[PDB]
Write a protein that binds this ligand. Structure first.
Ligand SMILES: O=c1ccn([C@@H]2O[C@H](CO)[C@@H](O)[C@H](O)[C@H]2O)c(=O)[nH]1
Ligand SMILES: O=c1ccn([C@@H]2O[C@H](CO)[C@@H](O)[C@H](O)[C@H]2O)c(=O)[nH]1
Lengths: 810, 810
């Protein structure tokens, strides 16, 4: 049907059909009379997977012979979403499979909807890891994702009575056809025990052994025949384990619980033992695998020329003392040499500056669980602090601030401080976030070693985030400028010479309309609720957090409502406000915010006076495959974090790419996006970082905004008095109390500018042609936000390897 | 190479090779340079499984259209062993796969050794269930095995320092290519809750739901293209389960523990809740599946014409109140009609008379776990006892003996009494065992309903137990009489006219020699110990139990040893005594017996005076695939249970079929075997059942045998005094104490006759030609012990269906 989806050849379509029928028969043990759509999804899924393996096998063979430097991306999170469509797209099989399945009398899109999301992460950091793997495979790097095969991923969110309910995400119930178990490469991981000293060094003894079994998932590059590996470890008990009898077998579960469930806290640290175990387990099994591959080429001077390890936040920071451990205690290198190898091998990415999100492990935990690693850490700290003392003699305060060991209540280990000391490079994830690291939380570190600190502004893969979710837009872009932009997103600049092209304007606007129609029906079919598709689609989707200021959004919504009710017969640009995201199960405020949003909907959506003019919808179970649907349908993207709090953001980039305009603050990558498109093409409002500091110095008093802004006073009174919850008039006391007395994020400070900026959006929306020309100018300057650009900079400036766009032979 | 192994056609061999290479590539994601033997086993395993599916699909289709009565075999045990060779044999693929794999440069036998045993049972009852499924598929019955998919089967036994150590049997580590998960037919099973009464009947409410997910394993008939189904349920938590958050997800394991491990007690009841849960779970999910298949043809009068349920011991006896429950509470039939349907549907097989093996569930357990089923049981009992009262008015003692409810200490439910009351047929498993049921433990029941009681003497499948484990013997038999005996084992009678054929005598003896050579090397390769292959191979393999009297065997061994030492330079027929079997983890005596046997070996096997004349070996980890190796290699089969205790035995039959002679007591099926071969062709010794009763009436005093038999006195003194354990002189005090003061099994009473009978065996062994002619006479009369005969009688006399030998189309 559409050209960017590839050739439907007569040979290929005929081949696909025969293999589909083969799998239905041999693999699924079914035939046409008893097959459900699920069986059809699987038969297609095995058929498409067949095209990967040949490529997968020769990619691993190529690396064996060429021996390039390997990149190891360690993350506790890989937020992959669905694999089938992405695999078709990267293999150029999409139209052929559509044809093949149409001829068998099936609808391929209906089949895609059956695949479970791999929800092996929380939000932005997990999903960046997914974009990175796609980009790495596309740029031909010999790269491996390593993580944990969680049996349950982020919980499924249901709303019952307006409240979030959590339900276990049993994503493996039906099988995962993409993974290949590899029990032959199972590795021991050790816990507890104690440290013995001998003539020939320290020894770690009396340990419990947990086994780590790997599962490999293929990662296809874009049309280049490269297929890389994402290897995820699963926990397994050894067979003499605990080995009265029945109970011993049942207790094998204690050891396997390591890989059972993903922790659902995002931007918040929770110091639980089970979490530390997961952190050690991924790092222990991964380093053994790394060292094993290295030995199959004695000589560790060359280890940094053959190995790069990227740490995704501090979650795998134990890589650092672990590699010291293996090199010092097992390979018998001296300290100084092992340390040089370590620093040269590891590099660290920070993702946040929020103090509650930083990992600070109690010493009593590490002592019990990892007694040797604690020793190594004390030794790293001592030698590090001697470089500090010697560079800043007499500065005793610097020493306590820079220590990897926090003193106080309970002693803690600051894992960020460890990652900086043991890495040759530390990066933030957007330019402003990188400067903030240098000026604030890591300033001492930066003065010590300026050369370690870099920026690598985040990006998204245009394969998933454009070609896959938005074929309509991809196609019309391809009609004008060719297909080459799919792996060179800079080429979208050529779209600027079409900003005054009448036919392009109508096409860009036609695609948005279609996506809106499609999403509007998806709302009615799968969740039974009605939206006007002619309204502006105002969407905020991201995890629920105080810093992300969904509350700011709520206050605007209430304002629009109170303005309609005051002057009912006045024209207002109609809007569908959609807000979605999961709250971490123990984040009480976040749960309250979800309840507020649905309460606003209960009132606004049933006011006959309001009519079709304002709708508020909470989008349940926001996840990757729901993002692929709502994002193409959006007109307005809300990125309204308090300046200085959103390290980068990546949702923002998805929306710029897919033809929504952005309202947001000068925060994170918003700054670079407005810089690329021009500030006039962006709706910027509110305090800058500097204003926030000015307000902190003198103190934030929210009463001041409540006394001066009668529109805001009225909202608060309505909140306090039971307007939104007539059966529990005091239901929202916590929210009001917080807003009034301890808002760490200054919601009221931005309120006025926000509402005013929002009237400018409605005004531009009244002029469709000029709304669309602004859209064209956003889309055409989103090139910089491709994760291909991001990974090319990591490759040249951190890893020391060169990308290449070159096909391997088929 | 050998004809009973089928055609190696040029088409088939070429096909097998291309599919093997396909699986190695697509399914295993490997190629020739990195493949291990394990990968080769799997590639063959998937290739052979491909030939099953077409047959599997049309067998299930045939049953749908013909609608024959279905047989449902419920068992908590299916002791399957390995599947690959058995599948080749029943499909006639064996020579073709040998060829195909030889041409790829592999050794197929070396590949077969990699397959894990499916050890989903304990011993004789579990393995009978396996023979039955093969026979049922071979005789074309529409039959389903139903059970539990245990994640760990019978433990692997290791001997450390002569003691049994247990190790978890992780049979699924590497995958099971034979099973097909069927998550689409998952069914709820309920526990706990309470009973509510309404206007329209009893209701079971507030229950915990456990989900039962089925796995289907194909069961191929012999060369008839029938493929039946063995369906095994796995336990799964529902998704709102327990649903602070982390702990809720981790606790999903409590529900899944139901299918985690097989209980390892054989001939011994253990009243643990987890066991009762497993019993209910298999019966609850199975009946729903049965009723579902029945509805897809309102009318339950015809249920018994479309459904038969066989209960394998009382482990699934809850089928009876469960079917009452569903029919009465859910389908709303009246009691009397539902009961008639139940009785007409169910039938019950007893496997033992040992009082400690009988299931007697505490009432307080059933009350908590299954409150409704307890009510139904009380109602069954009341109405049953009114038929007793009315048939035997005034007999108050009969009433208390026949009650399903035992009074006493704690009230219990006698599950045997329940199975008899709710079944139209009750059978023993050998003729003598069936008479013993009628005369002793079930006498009251028999006087009430004589017509329920039947016999169905056990059998073994000649596919596994001859063609598969002993191709040598199968072949030479086939040379003389054709192939037809493989599914009509009666034809072995024709072998009698060859008892004086010189060439046959030499062939039968050549096969035994080869099997002995092969097994003797298997001992050196895989367990590093040396045996003379010219010795008589004296083997006792079966679970370790006091009633099986391995101790009797031990006393003979010590006697032979003390006789060699007394007159060292006298000729004795040399022997290799092998004894093997697992002890249940809490059966202290059984563990002591294993230790005794290895202690005897430590002494006997290192006495230079003894030399090559006597060796004692304990065969570690006795299991199905070890039975397939030792049984063909045996000369002497030891079946020496105290008369009246071995319900039937089936090891005995394996040995008769494979050319060993039998020494044993007139117990179980030994009686029918000696009757078939002639008593002169069998080494019978010891008390009969009647002698045992005579000795009980007057009392068993073991001191009497110790005072009169100086050879026995000396053994006991050696035991007591530390001869066999010089570092713990009192190590065996428990065994001696037991033997002397409370032997429920009268080891000494049989000792004299045993030793004398054993000299007769050595004497026949000195004359090879006459030993072999006796062998030929055993083999030729083993026909009756085929499970095809057993199942044909079940079919005609219990189930009301006719067998057929007819091919389905290919
Ligand atoms: O715990 C955390 C800490 C940070 N991030 C996000 O990382 C993304 C990837 O770099 C950023 O774009 C986003 O700003 C940040 O909050 C998370 O998603 N979870
Ligand atoms: O718990 C038990 C009770 C009995 N049997 C055996 O059943 C076989 C099959 O019928 C019999 O041949 C054997 O005598 C009996 O002990 C067991 O294996 N386990």
């Amino acid at each position: 049907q559409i050209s960017v989806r590839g050739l439907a050849g007569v040979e290929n379509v005929t081949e696909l059909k025969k293999n589909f029928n083969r799998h239905l028969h041999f693999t699924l043990v079914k035939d046409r009379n008893v097959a459900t759509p699920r069986d059809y999804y699987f038969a297609l899924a095995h058929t498409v997977r067949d095209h990967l393996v040949g490529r997968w096998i020769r990619t691993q063979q190529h690396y064996y012979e060429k021996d390039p430097k390997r990149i190891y991306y360690l993350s506790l999170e890989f937020y992959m979403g669905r694999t089938l469509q992405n695999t078709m797209v990267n293999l150029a099989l999409e139209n052929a499979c559509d044809e093949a399945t149409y001829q068998l009398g099936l609808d391929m899109e209906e089949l895609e909807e059956i695949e479970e999301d791999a929800g092996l992460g929380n939000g932005g950091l997990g999903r960046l890891a997914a974009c990175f793997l796609d980009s790495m495979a596309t740029l031909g790097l010999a790269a491996y994702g390593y993580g944990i095969r969680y049996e349950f991923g982020i919980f499924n969110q249901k709303i019952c009575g307006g409240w979030q309910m959590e339900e276990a995400d049993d994503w493996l119930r039906y099988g995962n056809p993409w993974e290949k178990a590899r029990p032959e490469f199972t590795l021991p991981v050790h816990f507890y025990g104690r440290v013995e000293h001998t003539s020939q060094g320290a020894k770690w003894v009396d340990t419990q052994v947990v086994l780590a079994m790997p599962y490999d998932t293929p990662v296809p590059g874009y049309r280049n025949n490269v297929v890389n590996t994402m290897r995820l470890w699963s926990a397994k008990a050894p067979n003499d384990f605990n080995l009265g009898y029945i109970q011993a077998v049942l207790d094998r579960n204690l050891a396997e619980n390591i890989s059972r469930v993903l922790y659902p806290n995002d931007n918040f640290f929770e110091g639980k033992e089970l979490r530390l175990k997961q952190e050690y387990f991924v790092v222990a099994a991964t380093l053994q695998d790394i060292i094993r591959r290295f030995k199959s080429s004695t000589n560790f001077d060359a280890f940094p020329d053959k190995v790069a390890i990227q740490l995704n936040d501090t979650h795998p920071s134990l890589a650092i003392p672990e590699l010291m451990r293996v090199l010092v205690d097992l390979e018998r290198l001296d300290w100084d040499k092992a340390w040089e190898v370590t620093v040269k091998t590891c590099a660290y990415t920070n993702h946040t500056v929020l103090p509650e999100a930083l990992e600070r492990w109690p010493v009593h935990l590490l002592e019990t669980l990892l007694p040797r690693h604690l020793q190594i850490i004390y030794e790293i700290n001592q030698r590090f602090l001697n470089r500090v003392a010697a560079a800043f003699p007499g500065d005793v305060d610097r020493l306590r601030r820079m220590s990897l060991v926090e003193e106080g209540a309970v002693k803690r280990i600051n894992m960020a401080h460890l990652c900086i000391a043991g890495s040759h490079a530390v990066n933030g994830v957007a330019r402003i976030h990188s400067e903030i690291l240098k000026k604030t939380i890591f300033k001492d570190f930066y003065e010590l070693e300026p050369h370690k600190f870099q920026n690598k502004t985040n990006g998204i893969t245009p394969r998933r985030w454009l070609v896959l979710c938005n074929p309509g837009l991809a196609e019309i872009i391809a009609e004008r400028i060719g297909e080459e932009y799919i792996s060179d997103l800079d080429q979208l600049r050529k779209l600027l010479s079409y900003v005054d092209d009448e036919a392009f304007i109508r096409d860009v606007a036609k695609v948005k309309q279609e996506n809106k129609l499609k999403f509007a029906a998806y709302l009615e079919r799968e969740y039974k609720v009605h939206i006007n598709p002619n309204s502006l689609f105002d969407v905020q989707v991201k995890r629920i957090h105080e810093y992300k200021r969904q509350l700011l959004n709520c206050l605007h919504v209430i304002t629009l409502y109170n303005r309609i009710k005051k002057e009912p017969n006045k024209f207002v640009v109609p809007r569908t406000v959609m807000i979605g995201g999961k709250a971490a199960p123990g984040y009480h405020m976040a749960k309250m915010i979800i309840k507020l949003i649905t309460a606003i909907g209960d009132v606004v959506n049933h006011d006959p006076v309001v009519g079709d003019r304002l709708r508020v919808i909470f989008l349940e179970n926001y996840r990757v495959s729901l993002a692929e649907k709502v994002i193409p349908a959006a007109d307005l993207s809300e990125q309204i974090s308090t300046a200085g709090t959103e390290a980068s953001g990546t949702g923002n980039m998805k929306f710029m790419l897919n033809g929504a305009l952005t309202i947001g603050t000068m925060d994170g990558a918003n700054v670079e996006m407005a810089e690329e498109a021009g500030e006039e093409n962006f709706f910027i409002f509110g305090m800058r970082v500097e204003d926030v500091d000015r307000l902190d110095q003198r103190g934030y008093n929210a009463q001041e905004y409540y006394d001066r802004i009668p529109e805001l006073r009225q909202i608060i009174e309505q909140l306090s008095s039971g307007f939104f919850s007539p059966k529990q008039p005091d239901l929202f006391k916590d929210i009001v109390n917080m807003l009034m007395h301890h808002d760490r994020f200054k919601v009221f400070a931005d309120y006025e500018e926000y509402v005013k900026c929002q009237e400018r959006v409605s005004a531009l929306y009244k002029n469709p042609r000029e709304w669309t020309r602004m859209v064209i100018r956003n889309i055409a300057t989103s090139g910089k936000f491709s994760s291909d650009r991001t990974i090319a900079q990591y490759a040249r400036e951190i890893w020391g390897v060169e990308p290449s766009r070159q096909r391997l032979p088929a």
